[PDB]
Amino acid sequence: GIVEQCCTSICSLYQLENYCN
Amino acid sequence: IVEQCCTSICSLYQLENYCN
Amino acid sequence: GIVEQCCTSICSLYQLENYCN
Amino acid sequence: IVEQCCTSICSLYQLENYCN
Amino acid sequence: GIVEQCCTSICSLYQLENYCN
Amino acid sequence: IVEQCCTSICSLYQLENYCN
Amino acid sequence: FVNQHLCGSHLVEALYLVCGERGFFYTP
Amino acid sequence: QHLCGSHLVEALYLVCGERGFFYTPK
Amino acid sequence: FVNQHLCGSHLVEALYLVCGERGFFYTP
Amino acid sequence: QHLCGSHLVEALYLVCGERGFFYTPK
Amino acid sequence: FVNQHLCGSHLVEALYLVCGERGFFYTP
Amino acid sequence: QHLCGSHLVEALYLVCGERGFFYTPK
Ligand SMILES: NCCc1c[nH]c2ccc(O)cc12
Ligand SMILES: NCCc1c[nH]c2ccc(O)cc12
Ligand SMILES: NCCc1c[nH]c2ccc(O)cc12
Ligand SMILES: [Cl-]
Ligand SMILES: [Cl-]
Ligand SMILES: [Zn+2]
Ligand SMILES: [Zn+2]
């Protein structure tokens, strides 16, 4: 739920990396 | 930076060296 | 009024195509 | 995709094949 | 404080030019 | 425009000529 | 009209891709 | 036009962004 | 989900750069 | 720098985006 | 500061084009 | 991939955008 997590607070790079393949 | 990253390649981690 | 229509709801592609020339 | 669209050309409709 | 000035109203180009080096 | 600005170079001021 | 300006940046980019060789017009 | 790197992802988001998609280079 | 759509445009661009050769998945 | 494809449209939006503009490739 | 972060992405892109060879500084 | 022009600035904003940065071509 990247929209839910990351359009709410400013996600970190390690946080965005959970959506890498 | 434009040599480090445009000419030669660079990581996003190498880019962390340019922040404040 | 593309700003009015399309920055309100998520316009469709066919909707955005009304502003093509 | 990067052959379909970067190397060769592709439409936005051909891109609809990659969605979920 | 470019975020403070320019994510509040629509800054002008001459306004954005104060952050040039 | 794509000759004025892609092929040849152009300023942001030369671009002001294309506005409404 | 600030959230909209930002949104305008996204729209003309969407129109660039949607319209192709025909091109488009943008106008608030 | 050729859709390469970041612009291909942006083109993918224009078409699939409501419904999600996968981006796998290799 | 309009401010989010715009935000989605920014996220897949961030993921393009963060993931590299691995690539990513995006899904609301 | 050369303003081509999507970047030319973005440059046009930086200058004219308050007042609108036309983008006609041919 | 989330709508602003997104806005920051737009600003540094505007500054890239406005400043040219001089370059810029960005700082919240 | 090569980070050039506008994409290098976007890459810089992905890494430093919380903490600010300087962009100086020459
Ligand atoms: N740590 C900030 C990285 C980042 C760049 N662009 C973003 C967009 C949304 C987000 O939640 C986070 C980001
Ligand atoms: N159907 C979604 C297409 C789309 C892509 N970017 C957009 C920006 C605004 C909008 O209203 C719509 C869009
Ligand atoms: N005069 C509008 C120039 C402009 C382009 N992009 C922008 C983003 C934010 C802003 O405050 C201003 C701008
Ligand atoms: Cl935005
Ligand atoms: Cl490019
Ligand atoms: Zn590009
Ligand atoms: Zn945006």
Numbering used by the authors:
A (entry chain C), C (entry chain C), E (entry chain C): 1 to 21
B (entry chain A), D (entry chain A), F (entry chain A): 2 to 21
G (entry chain D), I (entry chain D), K (entry chain D): 1 to 28
H (entry chain B), J (entry chain B), L (entry chain B): 4 to 29
List sentences from the manuscript:
Insulin is one of the key human protein hormones that is responsible for the maintenance of metabolic homeostasis, with an influence on cell proliferation and regulation of aging. Insulin is a 51-amino acid protein consisting of two disulfide-linked chains (A1-A21, B1-B30) and exerts its functions through binding as a monomer to the (αβ)2 heterodimer tyrosine-kinase-type insulin receptor (IR)5 (10, 11). Insulin is produced from a single chain pro-insulin and stored in pancreatic β-cells in storage granules (termed large dense core vesicles (LDCVs)) from which it is released into the bloodstream in response to elevated blood glucose levels. The in vitro data showed that insulin hexamers can be grouped into three structurally distinct states/families: T6, T3Rf3, and R6 (15, 16), which differ by the conformation of the B1-B6 N termini of the hormone B-chain.
The crystal structure of insulin grown in the presence of serotonin and Zn2+ revealed a T3R3 hexamer (referred to here as InsSerT3R3), with six neurotransmitters and two Zn2+ ions per hexamer. The hexamer quaternary structure is indeed T3R3 as the B1-B3 N termini acquire here a more R-like (fully α-helical) fold rather than an Rf, “frayed,” conformation observed in T3Rf3 oligomers. Coordination of both Zn2+ ions is tetrahedral regardless of the R or T protein environment with axial Cl− ligands. Serotonin occupies six sites in InsSerT3R3: three phenol “main” sites I and three hexamer surface sites III. It is tethered into site I via (typical for phenolic ligands) HBs of its OH group to -CO of CysA6 (range of 2.41–2.43 Å) and to -NH of CysA11 (2.93–3.17 Å); a weaker HB -OH contact to -CO of SerA9 (3.38–3.41 Å) further stabilizes this phenolic anchor. A significant HisB5-Nϵ2·π pyrrole HB (3.46–3.56 Å) contributes to the immobilization of the serotonin indole ring, which is assisted further by more subtle van der Waals (hydrophobic) interactions, especially with LeuB17 (3.45–3.59 Å). The -NζH amino group of this side chain is hydrogen-bonded to Oϵ1 of GluB21 (2.55–2.75 Å) and -CO of CysA11 (2.72–2.79 Å). In contrast to site I, the serotonin-binding mode to site III is rather dynamic, indicating its mobility on the InsSerT3R3 surface. Although serotonin is pincered there in a hydrophobic clamp of TyrA14 (π·π interactions ∼3.5 Å) and the side chain of LeuA13 (from a symmetry related dimer), the ligands' electron density is generally less well defined there. The firmness of serotonin-site I interactions, which is propagated likely toward the N termini of the B-helix, combined also with a very good overall fit of serotonin into site I may be behind the induction of the R (i.e. not Rf) conformation of the T3R3 hexamer.
